[PDB]
């Protein structure tokens, strides 16, 4: 704001037009920053580089979980119905992070490739991520399911946000989705951005089925109530035969939450 | 309908739609750019071990000292920025010596962690500061209640701990400590 | 231009935008003419109170200082009364010590410094005003002009004010030194006539002389006599 | 005129001060309150929007006292209301501390209005968002009522209404004979007014708070005894068909 | 009455006689403008209300912080017509005029003391 | 590129363009949203490029439940095969250091499609106005030196106000308007720029004024008490959620 | 770049841009000589104001007199030099009051450079635009000359030239200075030659230059300014010498 | 999205009219742990909850101490908690030193609100982020006063401001009849049962996550911790369902 | 102040225009008409009658506490026009200044000194970058023992003047033109003539009929220097005597 008395302060922009408009000595700094911030795939087989993930092999289901809560849900519920092997991960240097982006491969029928990536992708690396994960023109038979959690102070309504009920589930489905929805769709005034939006946009523009699931929780730290709230998801053809043991999975989820991850010491 | 670029991290006193004062969170995030440290509380005293990471061989080894005396029975291990830690240490020494002169007895580790945290709480608006103290301390010592080891983070707290790292790769130095701690093992 | 809007920042060529803007503002004001002669000086100006609703008394332009210093503004009306009061206070402050009246030059320097002091600071606008002052010391006449930034000059026939370039061009071919006040007053009246947008009336001229008696201000009927003559 | 509505010390091409008008509008979204003066006294009444039953009577109230013979019926942001009440208390206290007797109502109202105006002149503090009523009573001067708008208005009203439900309240109050009445029927009139203008789709719980000062109490401000309040409540409830 | 809880910079001033006033016209001359302003503020606060002293004193504070740096003479053209001493020349400007100060301090020290950092 | 919604891509032969431009206040975006909502046009395809920040949402034109359940990517097109009108609906901010490739690709698509006219709606900063701009209308216009012989006489008859030179043009807050104008000055591509000075905050009346100013020339609506342009059904919660309880 | 709005912010390469810009202000003032000789210390000047309606004033408009021996010359914004010269006079007199000796050079140049720099570290005040050139004598270091800078980089220069066209004048002075053996008359001739070489070549006159000297004699340092008629014959002699170039 | 320009500071009014910083702080105070605040005719129990940074570390302090007849809880930011309890303690000590009677709660809470009202107006300052549940019995039965991030304090009978607590409010409202005549043990059992609803399913209250604190008629404010809280936490039935 | 000065050529007081005009004070001048009023003050040869306008928004509001004619000293008045919240402060400031002058010099102030003090303390608000130029029209009234009756007007910018007749409000132009036309005809005046002239000017500018109780009149005379306000009876009598 006002650094000192009487200083003229420019009005902060909203659209983003504050950006301004080269000599060789400056010509390289940009490329150094770009190479540091560039995204590369480092599938941990032997310092590999890899061409795209879907080029070497096809698949039918590519469920992706983004966010710590979604990763915990997938690592707790659907892991004991078979054995999974790792195919690769990615490395990122966003200033907000670095915590992994490892994919999973089932030793059974390989149509399922559930992913876990809690890393926060920047606002520009997402397109490169899509380019290096899918490619340019994939098949027209895949089904994509995305599970994410957002803060409750995003839903807009006439009533008070605090007065709103417990965390709930909302869905956004593309045109090419014959299956119905298990929860009411998101209202018009609310929109979603970043990686789930990029995935949904790519799926919509390339004419392949997709489905989006959101959770408007009031707490961002991982817990049991919010992850348990994802129960009604396990009733659709997107993920039906991958669940085989509910109570032991609940017990192992309780044990994982018992680890008491480092919370925030700013509050009490 | 539209996406707009709204920034709330600029400004030391700005509340984000959901709380979580961003400046203090960034100050906490800034700790990891430093040196690792460790401290174990045991029934027969406490122990500390802090790395140095000498830049060049020509630098004299004893020139840099993360370990620093506070009194005859209290020691702490700074991390992160250096000058701010020096200021905090000087204030702590002055405070404990003044208390000894006044009440004519020894310090209690909580009674000095409270003082240093109260000093560090003055971030905000007079030689008053203007930014949070991007530092961290591991106070250690022995008192009438026994041997104690206090942890003080940049924001406001002095939560008691038994073994808690502070430097980079704290996750590796925390999971292993959880796996190895016994609460009854010997000092050796 | 981002480098504008603040008087404490230099544009990346070497200038002060606010100072030049204030100079243009004081240029866009009311014409005024000052003539220095071997016997004395004359200051001539006109007022915007053309309508009969106004009054001749009360508000007035050429306010005397002490007995030998008289000024005239060519800028913002409500923005020089404070400066005039400060000038009178400074004159009296000098008079209590050094029991002899202020010479003109020291007063010019002090008022220039106090005016400049609102340039180098940050957060307050410069004064929009530029004033001539006439003195009579040591058997000599003195004339000076002040600028919004503050830089006194030993001017002789300045016609600063609105359309001052035409006044300067007209005066650069009439003044020839070695003149009495009788011809100087007529020359000043002609200079005002050259750019007035109308005809001079009995209540539009505020000439004031500073001969070796003091700072007598010409009475309206006396101004009528000179205007007719 | 968006663009100039960011600081008090900034005009608009039309000429209005936009922050002041924003503060004006910001007092609307609250409850409602009315106040009437009879021949020999005044009376007020506020629709206290009762929250969940966890609270109880004597909760956050809007019928403060400022002296032994004055009181307000503020309706707006509560923190600023408490600050203004403290300021008025201090003012009356200082006046009685050295000038004897008790402050006349007009002087105190003018002082409080000027103080609440003093903030909208600087780029350092925000203006107060709250309405403000200062009805009181005297022994020889009579019964006087004043209302103070957030910015500067300190007019004297026979009887007005402040808050969200204000236009209907003004229209209904217009049809009264509050120049030859007493303090035993204006209370019932106020109750019937507050129950004839009260939304129910967004409001659920009500608790009328009433207070009068006049010849019936020989110059003292206090809450009405529960018997009269209950009787007025029953009459107003039965009056709605 | 304080204990220590650089002597070259500030030295040679015994504690004995600062808590012992000099010639009785000492507290009425060292602090005169402050006392006059306090009396006027008290009068206005008593007779006109609580708004006037607050407004006037905060105006004083607003206008005070635009002068030149402390190690140079301050013109003080403003704040004077607002104070009311616009033409009240007296024994404050003709005797020991601060422009011709006989002793002068270091610039950085004086400005850092004015900021109150020390 | 231009990815059609259907299997094939319909061809636009000489169609007037209605693409917006990002600027302060999103005045152009709001005005063009109003235009789309009031013309009752329909979507024909999608525009896909790695320049806009990805964002997805429900249907912004959910007039009824028939079309209230659809997705909406950041960039999408619209058309009306009755009077040669097509519009863009950019509704996201630009990723840094990517404006030039997007402008190049859009100009290439404009050249390839062989359209007739292009119209750009944008805004500008209001505080950066010299004294000559105060006692004058804020509405203005700008056209490339290729459309003069066609509609310059009509524009002069409408008595509009031209830009001010320097000697190169420089309009603050354009964002991409200068790029389009400069890379069109050498490619012989004609378009007109109709900006409006505005300040940040609330801009709905300014959007309505810009729409009316554009209609003054295009005559999109009936030639010319205020219920002319239909407000879209998505402009309900402009200022966030409702008032929290017990605050007042 | 954008890191120049306030005089308290560095740059990614590392530089104070505001003071660098202020360094260009002294580039719009008259040139200033001041070569040093064995006996005297000559100091030329330049009068920009050459209008036909200006009356003469005592001690010209550039050369000043500090206490009894030291003079100065200013350049740049003249509105900020009347304060510096006054305060410098004050500091000299204050030192004399402290110690009863004539002031040396350092305890004046450093004293003023302190304030000149202190206005570049407490943002909220623009730095002084000046290029003060100093001169004087003492009993500790003989005759010496100093040249200042708006930021403050005073150096014990032996012959320099501030102001416009400083580069060419300094270079040609460096190429045509007889170091070690130097006389007052030869120094004055060299100064006239330098002034003729620089400037727009108007052949000069008595109404465009000002010369000050510091001849020390009889144990009482004096400062004198050459008369108006004391330089016309000098210019005539220089012109005769230049025309006496023989050649063919 | 028309709020980016009107929320960067605290001294600006939105066109609708509401300070957005106050709403943001009231949303922020919800980060912490639940804290029930039951009361009775003779005693005012104050049961809280404690989080855990890790299994190795120790828990935070949620039940501070003020004086012999008053004890506050905490919820939200732990930074301003100490900065405000210092003012608490200083005012109580001054009231005990000047006069010779315990400072009543009704004036202390008003003073705290008056102090917290200042930062919400001047520039360059931010509202506090505490959720105090001041409790204590002085002369006219125990009181339970709540404090919000805005300087708007409420009187109360029983509430659970803090973390996820709406279910706690519902439970506390369902059984809000027996709290007028019960012994200490029954009231503590009710408080713990009310707190148990906040805790997620398949989770019980251990000995290291409760901080029961009791002040009443003839006993000064004492905080209970560690194994000392076991006798109160014995019956608690067996499970919520 | 930790909020800064808004960037722009007309968004703050301390920034000059490219041509050199203070736009903020011009907005202040335009701000008087926002409230909507009209005030006319005419001086004859032995009287200083002042007329104004009174508008009641509704019926409930009392008619005795809405006056726009305050009293400064024992024999000086004012017809303050514009935003009430700022005139209500300038009146107190002027009263304090008058009391201070009477204490410091021991006699009643000539109108010129009070006008000059108000103008200076209003101008000082147009330099610091923390102030707002409060919009009013400080019109004075009163008699002097050395020059007779006098009428002075002040503006928010700080430019005062001496007028033989003044109109202030939303209809300044036509009222000033009418007064200019009328003054040039006859020179002598009297109390009744001045009151009738003021009433006629107000009626012909507003072009509406004046109810007997719509306009208040405050006057000062040579025989009765004390500032007095005409009651309802006198105003009604003059109104019914007009045009008869």
Numbering used by the authors:
A (entry chain I): 2 to 22, 30 to 58, 60 to 107, 119 to 288
B (entry chain D): 1 to 125, 130 to 192
C (entry chain A): 4 to 232
D (entry chain F): 5 to 245
E (entry chain H): 13, 15 to 18, 29 to 141
F (entry chain J): 1 to 166, 177 to 234, 241 to 264
G (entry chain B): 3 to 250
H (entry chain E): 1 to 241
What does the paper say about this structure?
Dedicated assembly factors orchestrate the stepwise production of many molecular machines, including the 28-subunit proteasome core particle (CP) that mediates protein degradation. The CP is composed of four stacked α-rings and β-rings, each containing seven distinct α or β subunits. Unlike conventional proteases, the proteasome harbors three different types of active site (β1 or caspase-like, β2 or trypsin-like and β5 or chymotrypsin-like), each present twice. Previous work identified five CP chaperones: proteasome maturation protein (POMP, also called hUmp1)29–34 and proteasome assembly chaperones 1–4 (PAC1–PAC4).
